[PDB]
Amino acid sequence: RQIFSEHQMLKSNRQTFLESQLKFGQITVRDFIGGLATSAPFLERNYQTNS
Amino acid sequence: MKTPLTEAVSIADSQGRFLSSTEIQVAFGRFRQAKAGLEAAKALTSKADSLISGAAQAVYNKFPYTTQMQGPNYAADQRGKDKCARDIGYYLRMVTYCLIAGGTGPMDEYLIAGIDEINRTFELSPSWYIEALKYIKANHGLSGDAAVEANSYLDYAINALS
Amino acid sequence: MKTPLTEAVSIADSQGRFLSSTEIQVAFGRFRQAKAGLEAAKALTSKADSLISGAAQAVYNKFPYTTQMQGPNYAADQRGKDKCARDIGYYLRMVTYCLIAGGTGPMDEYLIAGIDEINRTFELSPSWYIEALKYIKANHGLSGDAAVEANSYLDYAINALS
Amino acid sequence: MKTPLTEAVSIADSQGRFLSSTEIQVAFGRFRQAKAGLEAAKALTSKADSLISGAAQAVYNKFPYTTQMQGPNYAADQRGKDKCARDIGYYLRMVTYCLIAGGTGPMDEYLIAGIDEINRTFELSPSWYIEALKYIKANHGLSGDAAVEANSYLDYAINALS
Amino acid sequence: MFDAFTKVVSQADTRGEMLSTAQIDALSQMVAESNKRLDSVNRITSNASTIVSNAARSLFAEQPQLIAPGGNAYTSRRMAACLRDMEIILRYVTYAVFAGDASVLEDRCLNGLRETYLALGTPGSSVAVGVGKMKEAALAIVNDPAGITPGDCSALASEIAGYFDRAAAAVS
Amino acid sequence: MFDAFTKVVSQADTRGEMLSTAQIDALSQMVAESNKRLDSVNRITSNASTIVSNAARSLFAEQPQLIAPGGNAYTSRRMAACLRDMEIILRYVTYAVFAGDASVLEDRCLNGLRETYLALGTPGSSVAVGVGKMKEAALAIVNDPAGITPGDCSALASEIAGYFDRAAAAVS
Numbered sequence: 001r002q003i004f005s006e007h008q009m010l011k012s013n014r015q016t017f018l019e020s021q022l023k024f025g026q027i028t029v030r031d032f033i034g035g036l037a038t039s040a041p042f043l044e045r046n047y048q049t050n051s
Numbered sequence: 052m053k054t055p056l057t058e059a060v061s062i063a064d065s066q067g068r069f070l071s072s073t074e075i076q077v078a079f080g081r082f083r084q085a086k087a088g089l090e091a092a093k094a095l096t097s098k099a100d101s102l103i104s105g106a107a108q109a110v111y112n113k114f115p116y117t118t119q120m121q122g123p124n125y126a127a128d129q130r131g132k133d134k135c136a137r138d139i140g141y142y143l144r145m146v147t148y149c150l151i152a153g154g155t156g157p158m159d160e161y162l163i164a165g166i167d168e169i170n171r172t173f174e175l176s177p178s179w180y181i182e183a184l185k186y187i188k189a190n191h192g193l194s195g196d197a198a199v200e201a202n203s204y205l206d207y208a209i210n211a212l213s
Numbered sequence: 214m215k216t217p218l219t220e221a222v223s224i225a226d227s228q229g230r231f232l233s234s235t236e237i238q239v240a241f242g243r244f245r246q247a248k249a250g251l252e253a254a255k256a257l258t259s260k261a262d263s264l265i266s267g268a269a270q271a272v273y274n275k276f277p278y279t280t281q282m283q284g285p286n287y288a289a290d291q292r293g294k295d296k297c298a299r300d301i302g303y304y305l306r307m308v309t310y311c312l313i314a315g316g317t318g319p320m321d322e323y324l325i326a327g328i329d330e331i332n333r334t335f336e337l338s339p340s341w342y343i344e345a346l347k348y349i350k351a352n353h354g355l356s357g358d359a360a361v362e363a364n365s366y367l368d369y370a371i372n373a374l375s
Numbered sequence: 376m377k378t379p380l381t382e383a384v385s386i387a388d389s390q391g392r393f394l395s396s397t398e399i400q401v402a403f404g405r406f407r408q409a410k411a412g413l414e415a416a417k418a419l420t421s422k423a424d425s426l427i428s429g430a431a432q433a434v435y436n437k438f439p440y441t442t443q444m445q446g447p448n449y450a451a452d453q454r455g456k457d458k459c460a461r462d463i464g465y466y467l468r469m470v471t472y473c474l475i476a477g478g479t480g481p482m483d484e485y486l487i488a489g490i491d492e493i494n495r496t497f498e499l500s501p502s503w504y505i506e507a508l509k510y511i512k513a514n515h516g517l518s519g520d521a522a523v524e525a526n527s528y529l530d531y532a533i534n535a536l537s
Numbered sequence: 538m539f540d541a542f543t544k545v546v547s548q549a550d551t552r553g554e555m556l557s558t559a560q561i562d563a564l565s566q567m568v569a570e571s572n573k574r575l576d577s578v579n580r581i582t583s584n585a586s587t588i589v590s591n592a593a594r595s596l597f598a599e600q601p602q603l604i605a606p607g608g609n610a611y612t613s614r615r616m617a618a619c620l621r622d623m624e625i626i627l628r629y630v631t632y633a634v635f636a637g638d639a640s641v642l643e644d645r646c647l648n649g650l651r652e653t654y655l656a657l658g659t660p661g662s663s664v665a666v667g668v669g670k671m672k673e674a675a676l677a678i679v680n681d682p683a684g685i686t687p688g689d690c691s692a693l694a695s696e697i698a699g700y701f702d703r704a705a706a707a708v709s
Numbered sequence: 710m711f712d713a714f715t716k717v718v719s720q721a722d723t724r725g726e727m728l729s730t731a732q733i734d735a736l737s738q739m740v741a742e743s744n745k746r747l748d749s750v751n752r753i754t755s756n757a758s759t760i761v762s763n764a765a766r767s768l769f770a771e772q773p774q775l776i777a778p779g780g781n782a783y784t785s786r787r788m789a790a791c792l793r794d795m796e797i798i799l800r801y802v803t804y805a806v807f808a809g810d811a812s813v814l815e816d817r818c819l820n821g822l823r824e825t826y827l828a829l830g831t832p833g834s835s836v837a838v839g840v841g842k843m844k845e846a847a848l849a850i851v852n853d854p855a856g857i858t859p860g861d862c863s864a865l866a867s868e869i870a871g872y873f874d875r876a877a878a879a880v881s
């Protein structure tokens with residue numbers, strides 16, 4: 001909700017591998033936020049449509 | 052919009068570097084693909100209306116309950132059939148758009164990204180669209196490598212559906 | 214047994230003459246018909262059991278009172294359903310027989326000739342069989358000219374019913 | 376596990392403060408709820424097996440195609456009916472668990488969180504479960520405020536389904 | 538972010554005195570009808586997905602330009618975002634009629650979403666008509682007493698229609 | 710994270726010399742059969758959802774204890790996570806046979822996932838049998854020819870079965 005917005009919480013945007021790494025404690029919440037902000041759906045929808 | 056040249060530019064931009072021989076390899080490969088893919092897209096454009104009607108009839112054949120029960124999600128009335136065959140033509144048009152674009156980008160941006168919540172909200176079974184795409188990939192009548200990559204795009208739509 | 218070759222022989226016999234070019238025109242036409250009709254009859258033979266169950270379920274759906282009220286004419290008990298689906302399969306088998314024979318003769322001799330007095334004596338509504346034949350002609354799943362003449366035979370059975 | 380006492384502790388912990396009168400208001404309200412909800416859960420426990428069979432029969436009645444067509448997702452064979460009525464009893468057991476827990480937490484953790492992708496992968500229509508939950512919420516036979524909040528939990532499951 | 542009670546408390550603190558008696562009788566009647574407020578709120582809440590699907594169902598039957606290619610809600614992703622926007626508006630309506638104050642609905646949606654729909658190119662008229670139809674269907678779903686004791690929902694139809702009209706006018 | 714070519718480059722750099730001729734003829738034959746490698750990936754990839762559903766379909770027919778209450782894959786959420794774990798394993802198999810090296814499959818899932826399944830209480834035996842059945846079905850789906858040119862798939866059936874057995878043994 002913080003990184004994508006509510007309208008971008010689609011089943012197709014979900015990073016299932018990052019969620020399993022977070023739930024297993026392999027990555028921090030910070031690294032999860034970095035993984036979301038560097039994800040393909042974020043870059044396509046939010047980076048490519050802006051200056 | 053995952054198309055090969057766009058994603059090559061995205062790779063070179065995120066790396067912060069100029070273009071290398073890698074993107075030119077991507078390019079001679081993309082031109083090799085398009086050299087048959089554009090004519091295959093034109094052939095699908097020719098056979099499109101009969102393919103849409105055949106897919107709709109095969110969908111009514113495999114799922115006969117949708118023609119019978121009263122319900123605005125089902126195509127029992129005529130407006131269901133108009134809207135229904137409209138989204139058949141939508142699926143076929145997205146297949147041709149991905150054939151021209153050279154990647155799964157157009158279907159991923161126009162169809163896939165919200166299709167799950169739409170079928171959840173509207174009581175549409177995705178298996179109907181799977182049956183229609185199977186009929187299209189059986190009956191498109193292409194041959195060779197164009198036929199294989201057309202079947203690749205349709206199978207990608209099937210795997211994105213269910 | 215109104216089949217085209219039989220009635221051509223009956224015409225030539227009642228006229229007292231030999232065969233002419235008229236019967237040979239009838240013959241090249243009949244062979245043209247059978248050249249698709251035999252394969253369509255085989256396809257109906259393949260889809261027959263599911264069509265019978267779907268027609269019985271559609272008949273129970275449109276007329277739900279027949280499943281509820283006690284009566285030996287109604288299919289409330291199990292023997293009514295066995296006999297009922299048996300005469301569904303009877304109707305479908307007569308449709309396939311007329312598809313092979315090339316005329317309405319087999320249904321006219323096996324079904325139509327006494328069906329009115331039977332439904333009169335047994336308190337069977339013919340509208341049940343009309344609903345079942347409508348479901349069959351909607352759900353048989355054929356295509357093209359074979360589908361049109363299959364619908365012709367089923368519509369003939371409907372018009373003979375009511 | 377969204378239950379009222381758990382979420383009150385989560386509020387007081389995330390705020391970093393002690394418990395206030397707000398959580399005690401939450402508590403006298405929760406005890407007021409449980410004072411009828413536990414007996415209503417026992418009554419649902421009593422009527423559970425007949426409710427499960429009635430829901431399965433209503434689901435077979437509204438969707439008769441699932442009993443007919445061959446397919447491992449459909450309950451045509453017997454193992455489909457065993458697994459099917461097993462997940463009917465699963466839904467009813469989660470309803471009773473939320474009745475005891477006092478919140479939608481148990482169904483949200485045991486049913487809802489993955490049900491969409493499961494029905495997507497397995498070709499299960501959620502409308503079957505909506506019909507079954509509608510039959511349960513019609514036929515549970517409770518009365519009064521316990522009946523209203525039972526219908527609340529079942530309607531929550533329906534809205535989470537579609 | 539205000540209740541009814543916090544609204545009376547903030548007004549009494551801005552006055553600087555204690556709460557007057559007539560406001561306390563009004564709040565006592567509010568405490569008597571707050572559960573009454575609630576019954577509509579729970580029967581409004583339970584049918585929310587049906588409400589938003591029927592609202593989009595009538596809206597896209599009414600304005601087929603949005604479904605038409607090039608339309609604002611044409612794309613599958615955009616159409617899912619459309620249903621998400623509608624469901625969010627209905628949820629904050631239910632929150633505002635839970636707390637009994639429109640300040641939560643104002644705080645969470647209204648001041649920004651008009652500018653958002655301008656900047657997005659979203660037609661404010663269609664979503665205004667959709668919120669109006671959703672509110673009409675919501676009061677129509679709330680007002681029917683199916684398996685409910687006989688009571689009076691008058692003033693609360695008043696309040697719910699007020700919240701829906703405030704949302705539809707702040708959308709524009 | 711290695712290719713075939715980067716593997717030969719790293720080995721030649723650890724040797725410190727240039728690439729020998731026989732390795733270049735091997736890489737030329739690899740470049741000739743790399744598209745051949747590709748057809749399996751192309752036809753392995755297109756049927757992936759059918760592969761994982763049939764694999765879980767046979768596995769949960771085979772071990773009904775997982776579906777049984779108290780079983781590890783009993784809960785709906787856990788069962789969805791189960792199918793997700795299987796689909797991830799199949800995807801990294803397809804990546805490793807794309808790049809022609811098992812180092813991507815090692816890097817991505819093998820090292821950690823054994824300890825993950827120990828810590829979770831996940832039975833490694835069932836998922837090992839499921840990856841084995843999925844690999845058997847994957848080679849069975851890849852090997853059949855429909856309107857396909859006659860070709861020899863032996864060393865690539867060899868390589869794909871190697872990748873699947875490496876995954877199943879690293880799972881344990």
Ligand SMILES: *[C@H](C)[C@H]1/C(=C/c2[nH]c(/C=C3N=C(/C=C4\NC(=O)C(CC)=C4C)C(C)=C\3CCC(=O)O)c(CCC(=O)O)c2C)NC(=O)[C@@H]1C
Pocket residue numbers: 005006007008603609610614615616618619620622623625626645646650653657659660661662663664667
């Ligand atoms: C359907 C009723 C109408 C419609 C909806 C529509 N909205 C969007 C995109 C956005 N909507 C919002 C709105 C909100 N975000 C919030 O957080 C809140 C309050 C909590 C509200 C009210 C925002 C921020 C966006 C943009 C970002 C996003 O993911 O959703 C779209 C899609 C536009 C796009 O290009 O994606 C649509 C279609 N539009 C219509 O056509 C109807 C009139």
Ligand SMILES: *[C@H](C)[C@H]1/C(=C/c2[nH]c(/C=C3N=C(/C=C4\NC(=O)C(CC)=C4C)C(C)=C\3CCC(=O)O)c(CCC(=O)O)c2C)NC(=O)[C@@H]1C
Pocket residue numbers: 520523524569570572573576577579679680681682685686687688689690
């Ligand atoms: C409103 C559109 C219709 C209406 C409602 C109405 N309700 C009441 C009284 C009660 N309603 C409830 C409901 C609940 N209490 C709970 O704890 C829950 C679970 C969340 C529910 C569903 C209850 C319990 C009461 C009061 C206490 C009781 O019933 O035991 C009234 C009259 C009483 C009051 O003002 O609260 C009314 C009128 N009646 C209509 O005619 C409208 C169509």
Ligand SMILES: CCC1=C(C)/C(=C/C2=NC(=C\c3[nH]c(/C=C4\NC(=O)[C@H](C)[C@H]4CC)c(C)c3CCC(=O)O)/C(CCC(=O)O)=C2C)NC1=O
Pocket residue numbers: 110117123124125126130131132134135136138139141142161162169173175179594597604611612613616
């Ligand atoms: C360009 C990509 C694209 C797709 C795929 C798409 C699908 C789509 N199909 C819809 C409805 C529909 N979809 C169907 C389709 C069917 N139902 C059946 O019984 C048949 C099996 C099948 C015929 C193919 C029907 C009948 C409706 C109208 C039902 C409704 O009110 O929602 C709707 C809701 C809009 C509306 O209500 O009119 C969307 C968004 N829209 C898009 O923009």
Ligand SMILES: CCC1=C(C)/C(=C/C2=NC(=C\c3[nH]c(/C=C4\NC(=O)[C@H](C)[C@H]4CC)c(C)c3CCC(=O)O)/C(CCC(=O)O)=C2C)NC1=O
Pocket residue numbers: 272279285286287288292293294296297298300301303304323324331335337341
């Ligand atoms: C080959 C052509 C052929 C046809 C068509 C045929 C029909 C036929 N159906 C009969 C009875 C029946 N027909 C029905 C059928 C139905 N009742 C329902 O409620 C359902 C709507 C419908 C199911 C399709 C039933 C249940 C009976 C048994 C009732 C009886 O005692 O007479 C009978 C009387 C024989 C008997 O009593 O068992 C005949 C002759 N027989 C034939 O030889």
Ligand SMILES: CCC1=C(C)/C(=C/C2=NC(=C\c3[nH]c(/C=C4\NC(=O)[C@H](C)[C@H]4CC)c(C)c3CCC(=O)O)/C(CCC(=O)O)=C2C)NC1=O
Pocket residue numbers: 434441447448449450454455456458459460462463465466485486493497499503766769776783784785788
């Ligand atoms: C505790 C909460 C919970 C739920 C809800 C649940 C559902 C659930 N139902 C399943 C299958 C199934 N679900 C159904 C159900 C039906 N199909 C029909 O035709 C009927 C309309 C309906 C009967 C109610 C059937 C027949 C299967 C077996 C089909 C399969 O192989 O996947 C599966 C896959 C497991 C398997 O294949 O055996 C899950 C996870 N599991 C859970 O742990």
Ligand SMILES: CCC1=C(C)/C(=C/C2=NC(=C\c3[nH]c(/C=C4\NC(=O)[C@H](C)[C@H]4CC)c(C)c3CCC(=O)O)/C(CCC(=O)O)=C2C)NC1=O
Pocket residue numbers: 016017018019020021023024775781782786787788790791792794795797798817818822825829831832833834835836839
């Ligand atoms: C990219 C590589 C990668 C792998 C391999 C991976 C595995 C992985 N599987 C997990 C859970 C799981 N994995 C399984 C799978 C199974 N359990 C069974 O019963 C069967 C034997 C088997 C089905 C084949 C199940 C059921 C869970 C759920 C455990 C739980 O949620 O409590 C979890 C815990 C967190 C979570 O799923 O949401 C991780 C991290 N994660 C990764 O990021």
Ligand SMILES: CCC1=C(C)/C(=C/C2=NC(=C\c3[nH]c(/C=C4\NC(=O)[C@H](C)[C@H]4CC)c(C)c3CCC(=O)O)/C(CCC(=O)O)=C2C)NC1=O
Pocket residue numbers: 196199200744745748749751851852853854857858859860861862
């Ligand atoms: C990404 C889109 C794409 C595809 C799909 C593709 C496939 C493809 N497979 C080829 C060859 C081939 N493909 C096969 C595959 C097999 N033969 C068998 O009998 C086995 C069962 C099976 C492997 C399991 C064989 C044997 C050849 C012979 C030519 C060669 O070695 O490439 C070739 C060589 C050039 C040509 O056919 O014109 C193409 C184009 N090329 C593309 O650009």
